[PDB]
Amino acid sequence: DDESSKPCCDQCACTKSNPPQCRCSDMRLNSCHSACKSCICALSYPAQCFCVDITDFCYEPCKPSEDDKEN
């Protein structure tokens, strides 16, 4: 029922490694969620944040619900 916490992604990227490394949702103009143990955040306005946590599959794009939304 809590599909709002489901981890997602936006800007995905992988580093040359073996296995390859992969961090995503690099920057955030607000804050993170419950999928970044090592998240950095600057309590300011406009707020600033980052997620250095890494995975091996790069989560899937965000913006649940239908498909696109803005464009």
In sequence order, the 6+-apart residues with CB closer than 8 A to the CB of 55 are 22, 23, 24
Q: How was this structure determined?
A: NMR
Could you please report the per-residue DSSP string of 12-55? EEEES-SSPEEEE--EESS---SS-TTEEEE-SSS-EEEE---B
Domains of the chain: 1-71 (2.10.69.10)
Chain breaks in the chain (C to N over 2.5 A) after: none
Token pair for residue 13?
Answer: 């990227």
- SS3 state of residue 70: coil
